[PDB]
Design a protein around this ligand. Structure first.
Ligand SMILES: [Cl-]
Ligand SMILES: [Cl-]
Ligand SMILES: [Cl-]
Ligand SMILES: [Cl-]
Ligand SMILES: [Cl-]
Ligand SMILES: [Cl-]
Ligand SMILES: [Cl-]
Ligand SMILES: [Cl-]
Lengths: 308, 308
């Protein structure tokens, strides 16, 4: 069992039990689960815990909105009859409704009405509340890129094409499908700040987000693999024709290499702020931005340890 | 006939005839027009001229890409059999493919393949070329908001609901449907600069884009009206129960009031740059940003004068 020793110490929200309880009633009220068995399957994933570790500064009511959101993505596949002929077309259709919801005024009804799209129209109204147009645009494209990539994964599987990606293509693709850019963006909503726009578009920060997404997608592949061809481990083994264990070792080395480059860019943040000429309150907002990334890398890891 | 005397003097591209000729062959090569009559109808709109007045600094090859893009939006309705039962559903479907194209790597094939989506997948690869992730995100959300709003207009008509918007809702809606935010964004691609991100998200610039969009949507309604219920003039008349001429006068007064507020914010740009602490090359990029807005307001007007 691959363990990582990460150099972060990261808070956990005090609102876990308060918000879990509301969140669990909400999944029923919004008809995202339909049977007792489906519900208990959903509960076993312990998504509330992930939300509490990744958004640790949220107010209690916002922790509820965050858990609700968290559930949308993970329940998304499970909204559709798995044996129907055109499953992959219905998924694309629903995903695209989720993509346009942040591109229309908050409170507008979705065109494709199903439990997930109605749930998301609700959540987006809260998640966007109080946030600038700059943040909403950034979120909207991050979320959109994620969902497009999710549709590509779904089509890859429906077409009989899992196992065809080589290492470099797989790594590029996994950066997209892991959905961490929009996850980081929401840190600003959860804690009530916005990162200065000239810092968000600086090469250091853009690269940091990409490495955070690599690191997390690769840890998640290592973790899913250890409990079972579209998986970093499998891909490495096909690519190198090595043992299952040499492929594990190499996945581990790739992950630590992403992490270490992430840590090097972290130490460069003060120089970035100097080159941008940021004042002290801007610097402070940057620092909080970097912490949202740490919450994701560390919190995701610590949640994965306790199963799901 | 309402005339406006605008306080802008605005260049026109020298590449009009060079690019028109390539652009006209392209609309056939991409199968956007299908008959000689459809083509001559397309030619009468003189979209090349609009592109030459709105993107006057484009290189010659980029002027071609801009005209090609211009054509996509205007040909879009005309790609679909107008009498089929579910026209409005097919439009939404195609619009959403156009929305996700900028949310996936350049050169990827569209999932819904038809002449317009293939054409756009091509155009986006050139339009995004050399542009930062910040610009592509901004463009992508602007274009997306436009297309969503276009689908809302299409559904409004298919449902028998034209003529139901009151004045305030109509004004809000027309800001969305006129599609000027993404039009302004492309000025940076055409001329080869990017506006500093902290200026783009400043309240002055965000408001300037909104007023430019009002001004242009209202001029375009005045101009379409004078050559014929979803029209500023008609809406004002329903709202005020006034004469067709008093409704025209009032549309004219609303437009001049948007314009004058636009002109007041224009004079505030140097103070904005001071409050942001921009250096001189950043100031210069801002100034070019403002010129892209002027090119749109002035160029659209001067193009409208010569019919279509
Ligand atoms: Cl947080
Ligand atoms: Cl998520
Ligand atoms: Cl392979
Ligand atoms: Cl802030
Ligand atoms: Cl230009
Ligand atoms: Cl356009
Ligand atoms: Cl009315
Ligand atoms: Cl520039």
């Amino acid at each position: 069992d691959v363990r990582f020793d990460l150099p972060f110490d990261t808070p956990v929200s005090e609102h876990l039990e308060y918000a879990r309880a509301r969140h669990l009633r909400w999944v029923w009220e919004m008809r995202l689960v339909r049977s007792r068995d489906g519900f208990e399957e959903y509960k076993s994933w312990d998504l509330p815990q992930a939300a509490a570790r990744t958004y640790p500064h949220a107010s209690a009511d916002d922790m509820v909105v965050l858990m609700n959101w968290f559930s949308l993505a993970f329940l998304f596949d499970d909204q559709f009859d798995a044996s129907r002929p055109d499953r992959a077309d219905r998924i694309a259709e629903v995903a695209r409704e989720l993509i346009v919801t942040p591109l229309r005024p908050a409170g507008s009804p979705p065109r494709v009405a199903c439990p997930i799209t109605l749930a998301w129209a609700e959540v987006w109204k809260y998640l966007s509340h109080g946030m600038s147009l700059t943040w909403q645009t950034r979120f909207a494209a991050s979320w959109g890129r994620f969902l497009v990539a999710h549709c590509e994964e779904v089509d890859l599987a429906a077409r009989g094409l899992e196992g065809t990606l080589g290492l470099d293509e797989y790594a590029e693709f996994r950066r997209r499908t892991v959905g961490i850019h929009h996850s980081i963006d929401a840190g600003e909503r959860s804690r009530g700040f916005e990162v200065p726009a000239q810092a968000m578009g600086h090469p250091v920060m853009e690269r940091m987000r990409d490495l955070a997404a690599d690191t997390i997608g690769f840890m998640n592949d290592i973790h899913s693999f250890e409990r079972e061809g579209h998986n970093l481990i499998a891909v490495l083994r096909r690519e190198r024709g090595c043992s299952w264990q040499q492929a594990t070792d190499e996945a581990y080395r790739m992950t630590i290499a992403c992490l270490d480059e992430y840590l090097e860019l972290q130490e460069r943040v003060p120089q970035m702020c100097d080159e941008l000429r940021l004042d002290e309150a801007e610097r402070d907002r940057v620092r909080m931005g970097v912490e949202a990334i740490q919450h994701w890398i560390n919190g995701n890891y610590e949640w994965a340890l306790t199963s799901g």
